Design a protein around this ligand. Structure first.
Ligand SMILES: Nc1ncnc2c1ncn2[C@@H]1O[C@H](COP(=O)(O)OP(=O)(O)O)[C@@H](O)[C@H]1O
Ligand SMILES: O=C1CCCC2=C1[C@H](c1cccc(O)c1)NC(=S)N2
Ligand SMILES: [Mg+2]
Length: 332
């Protein structure tokens, strides 16, 4: 089965000032999320769901990274392909989890910032893990985004954001795709990481000015490819190639998002064991086909809100994530 975990965000200043009370309780021991759905103080109804891990509102980024990402990175380094999705309502912390933010007032360098998310920590950690173990390696990254079923490259320095890319089937791979023109940027060392991310964020701002509600309607796929070579005591070369996809999905909230609709239908087909799985009906599912019932090791981080206002979308996210637990992949 694929791994599914839930992370609740903390209340913001607005909500605190209103003296909001959380409707979500996370029990990491029981690995349970419980949501208050109705009823007064002294008596209530709840809905409860069990996941692979649960992370309550006070969970820090480093603890998400250690619990979830560390083991996945180790499998990437062994030469497996892995994907982590963030799924949930706009405003629940998909981008916070996958990217993170900067601590205010230049308190930290990027490497040491506690608010850093999965992407920067991962890139930083690859260089640390492979520092002097006998494995020669290179790291390449791309950042592809999908908005209104069009493809954009958020790292090509010499293309304007608005040039769409074209996708084709990869002839040497049944079910693989080729994305014509997608830039892969070589990351030569840890000191090259930040400015690469910065250039991405700058292209994203241009995108947002151009395309309506870009940040909530777009899907983004940040790919890290690690090409590895070991030499044995007899001078034989051993090759390993690991790929990690870190995906920040469109907001799940209730205009037409074909890729998000098709993801849900792919999940349904897989869990119901329907023989036709509709991968080909969107760009997102064609690109990530191998992550959904394929040979990639997959995790989903489902993000939720503590706030009573968000009750129905929270329940929808939890039901969707709980169903996805039944997806079966066959890694390597
Ligand atoms: N775990 C968290 N810790 C601190 N702040 C968070 C957390 N999750 C979300 N936030 C804050 O909540 C807001 C929405 O998060 P964001 O990542 O933009 O959500 P999404 O991508 O799901 O719309 C941002 O202001 C972010 O800083
Ligand atoms: O905060 C920014 C601004 C520049 C672009 C960017 C981010 C975050 C990030 C990167 C490194 C360290 C962080 O604390 C946050 N995460 C990503 S993936 N990119
Ligand atoms: Mg976001």
């Amino acid at each position: 089965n694929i791994q599914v975990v839930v992370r609740c965000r903390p209340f913001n200043l607005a909500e605190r000032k209103a003296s909001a009370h959380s409707i979500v309780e996370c029990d990491p021991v029981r690995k349970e999320v419980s949501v208050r759905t109705g009823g007064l103080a002294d008596k209530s109804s709840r809905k409860t769901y069990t996941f692979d891990m649960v992370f309550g509102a006070s969970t820090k980024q480093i603890d998400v990274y250690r619990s979830v990402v560390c083991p996945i990175l180790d499998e990437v380094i062994m030469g497996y392909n892995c994907t982590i999705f963030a799924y949930g309502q706009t405003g629940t912390g998909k981008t916070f989890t996958m990217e993170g933010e900067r601590s205010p007032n230049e308190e930290y360098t990027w490497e040491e910032d506690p608010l850093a998310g999965i992407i920067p920590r991962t890139l930083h950690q690859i260089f640390e893990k492979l520092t002097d173990n006998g494995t020669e390696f290179s790291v390449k990254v791309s950042l592809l985004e999908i908005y209104n079923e069009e493809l954009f490259d958020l790292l090509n320095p010499s293309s304007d954001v608005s040039e769409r890319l074209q996708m084709f089937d990869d002839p040497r791979n049944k079910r693989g795709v080729i994305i014509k023109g997608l830039e892969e940027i070589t990351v030569h060392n840890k000191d090259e990481v930040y400015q690469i991310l910065e250039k991405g964020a700058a292209k994203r701002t241009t995108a947002a000015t151009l395309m309506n509600a870009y940040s909530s309607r777009s899907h983004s796929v940040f790919s890290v490819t690690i090409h590895m070579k070991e030499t044995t005591i007899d001078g034989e070369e051993l090759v390993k190639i690991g790929k990690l996809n870190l995906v920040d999905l469109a907001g799940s909230e209730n205009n037409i998002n074909q890729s998000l609709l098709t993801l849900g239908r792919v999940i349904t087909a897989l869990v119901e064991r329907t023989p036709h799985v509709p991968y080909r009906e969107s760009k997102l599912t064609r690109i990530l086909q191998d992550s959904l019932g394929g040979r990639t090791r997959t995790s989903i981080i489902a993000t939720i809100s503590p706030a009573s206002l968000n009750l129905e979308e929270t329940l929808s996210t939890l039901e969707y994530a709980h169903r996805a637990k039944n997806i079966l992949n066959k890694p390597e």
